[PDB]
Design a protein around this ligand. Structure first.
Ligand SMILES: NS(=O)(=O)c1ccc(-c2ccc(CC(=O)NO)cc2)cc1
Ligand SMILES: [Zn+2]
Length: 255
């Protein structure tokens, strides 16, 4: 199979006599195919930075093993040539500490797998705006990816209402260093949506939020480049193309 880096892939497998799905010694969870009852699904993601050239998954069954080969593609992302090497930047220890703390808080949340659907049908757009900055915009130094845009940015003046893209449980609802005022929703199955640089947060941690329900007002908090909404999707343990994902997810979980 073929998958562009920084993208998610819903794998289809026979339900019957299935024991596990592995990638070397790291197990991948599975969930029901909502229409076809003889199948199950698994989300596989390739990171934008340093993906392997290829991947070999193994679906182990009671009576056999079933290999999946996935070729990694570069795709067609925008990329600007960097001039100054991404040298180890030297922040004040107060900022270093906050980033480290927030990294630890985030990793714990993003590997807190919930084995049921908290969502309700398809994802919707968190607002009815347009993309000002695509996902996957890379900054490159001697053909190596130094950094990239982990989500997609919508046009939003400060104070534009933002709504949850799907139903779920709120896991983060606060100001963070890089993200600014952040909302992060667990939709189940390792699927998390992200809403950053808000001017106002209208939800609490642990709160059940419905799709289409208001989560906050867009802002510019922690955003150097002016007011806008940053929308991100983490799934299969990786930041992925949010619109590519929504499209793939929605084709399965429509109604
Ligand atoms: N879920 S997480 O691990 O806490 C997390 C992931 C990504 C970012 C992030 C930081 C800076 C920018 C720059 C930008 O131009 N935004 O508009 C974009 C995204 C922040 C937090
Ligand atoms: Zn952004």
């Amino acid at each position: 199979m073929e998958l562009i880096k920084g993208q998610a892939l819903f794998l289809e497998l026979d339900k019957k006599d299935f024991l596990s799905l592995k990638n070397n010694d790291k197990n991948i969870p599975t969930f029901a195919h909502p229409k076809n009852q003889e199948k199950i699904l698994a989300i596989f993601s390739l990171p934008y930075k340093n993906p392997p050239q290829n991947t070999k998954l193994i679906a182990f069954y009671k009576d056999k093993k079933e290999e999946i080969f996935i070729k990694t593609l570069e795709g067609n992302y925008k990329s600007e040539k960097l001039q100054v090497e991404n040298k180890k930047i030297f922040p004040p220890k107060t900022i270093q500490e906050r980033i480290a703390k927030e990294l630890k808080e985030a990793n714990a949340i993003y590997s807190s797998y919930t084995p049921k659907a908290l969502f309700n049908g398809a994802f919707n757009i968190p607002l009815n705006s347009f993309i000002t900055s695509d996902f996957g915009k890379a900054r490159t130094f001697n053909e190596k990816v130094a950094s990239y845009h982990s989500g997609t940015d919508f046009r939003a003046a400060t104070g534009t209402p933002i709504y949850a893209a799907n139903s779920g449980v709120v896991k983060i609802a606060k100001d963070r260093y890089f993200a600014g005022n952040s909302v992060v929703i667990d939709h189940g199955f390792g699927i998390y949506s992200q809403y950053y640089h808000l001017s106002k947060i209208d939800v609490k941690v642990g709160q059940k939020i419905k799709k289409g329900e208001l989560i906050g007002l867009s802002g510019a908090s922690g955003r150097v480049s002016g007011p806008a909404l940053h929308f991100g999707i983490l799934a299969g343990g990786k930041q992925v193309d949010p619109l590519d994902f929504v499209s793939k997810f929605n084709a399965i979980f429509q109604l």
